[model samples]
Target: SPSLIAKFEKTSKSNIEGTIKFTPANNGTVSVSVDLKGLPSDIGPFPYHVHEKPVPASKNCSATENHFNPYNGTVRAATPAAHEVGDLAGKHGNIMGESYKTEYDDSYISLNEKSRSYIGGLSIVIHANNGTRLNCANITLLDEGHGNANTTM
Candidate 1:
């Protein structure tokens, strides 16, 4: 399987910019690497998630819809598996700085399209500390030449 990537750019609503890479890992887990910056100084922790739909042509982050929850997971759960599959903030942690970088292996997300946890062809949305939609980008195949419905950008 090919690696997945979601890219965010500066917009009128936000100055945040970054790229999130999801590489296939061993044992059905996905390796997630996040590198983001340009966040507003006043805002505190920012929570990001893998939305169910891709960013629309309008480039409106709000149209991306809710979290990707192939599994009927709960946000109030006590464990990572119990939380929604798209709840990266819950599984990992929230972004808490103007520039943030982190890497971790996520056992709940998959690269295999056949798996319910497959997160390709979706979108990742970043929210302000107050839960306002700040920016978003579609998760597309990293240009390795595999060529799927989801290409770059």
Candidate 2:
């Protein structure tokens, strides 16, 4: 299985940073972990998801489009589902404030190319303080045939 990695920076030129780790696991699921820093202290949970598009040069979250819902080969667009497939924070983790860290095996996600969980060209988005999109990063395969996903602190 391939472990995908992505990095997130502040929507601006701020010092905020984050990382998303994706690993294919059993039961048609994917193991995911999220870590972020430089967020304001929070008393509530922040929402996060895997959007359909890669990192935008304009650094706009809207450009990432909707969440990653790959309904296989039949349909072409994503619909408004109650619990969307890419709703990472909905079922699993949350960011409380300045920094966050958590791990979960996501049953709704997939690593297979044809599966909806396939995140080859997608990006990880984190909606921080007051339900705002703080930052995001496009996910990509490890370059040069590397077995493990790239991780940079």
Candidate 3:
């Protein structure tokens, strides 16, 4: 187990709070626990992603504007519809409700910057419903940081 873990805060703002835990297990697999509260029950099936941003992507809130595409807009996959690196939901499934948790083998996500899948200096972005951009939080890998992305700022 690589012990790659993270706790996300609210950014990018509504009247809700969310907490997610990401634990990376070997074999190109990782598990996530997404717990949310105070969100309106009217909408559902929210989607999320691992964006390449140390912060919310912009002061005016545009986290989804730039995805974690290392190739800088050049890699494309279709597969029966292929999935991208930032497509956390595509690898698994979109989430909603009080808690959304799952485990899967992601060939495109890494924890260390030195390695290929290193997802350091990235932000976790959530959408309200259908790509509405709900909120976001930056994740700090211990190898590259400590307190900056651990606590709510």
**What clash count goes with each model?**
0, 1, 3
lDDT of 2 by residue, 1-153 (tens): 557888877645444587888887766678887777876555346677788888778887768887675542212224323456777666564666677888878876666667645777788777654656667788876434643565433
Top candidate on lDDT is 1
Select the stronger candidate by lDDT from 1 and 2: 1
lDDT tens string, model 1, 54-150? 8998779989888998788887668888989999998898887889999999988888888778888999999987888888999998876555555
* lDDT, candidate 3, 7-35, per-residue tens: 54444356446565556765665556666
Q: How do the candidates rank by TM-score, highest first?
A: 1, 2, 3
After superposing candidate 2 on the true structure, give the runs of residues whose Cα lies further than 4 Å from its correct spot: 10-14, 42-44, 70-82, 146-153
User: Between the candidate structures 1 and 2, which one is better when assessed by TM-score?
Assistant: 1
By summed lDDT, the worst window of 10 consecutive residues in model 1 runs over: 144-153
lDDT of 2 at 122: 86
Per-model TM-score on C-alpha atoms: 0.90, 0.75, 0.68
- Pairs of residues at least 3 apart in sequence or in different chains that clash in candidate 1: none
Say which prediction, candidate 2 or candidate 3, comes out ahead on TM-score.
Answer: 2
| Model 2, global lDDT | 0.69
| Candidate 2 minimal-lDDT segment of 10 residues | 72-81
What is the clash count of model 2?
1
Query: Where is the poorest 10-residue window by lDDT in model 3?
Result: 72-81
lDDT of each: 0.87, 0.69, 0.59
lDDT of 1: 0.87
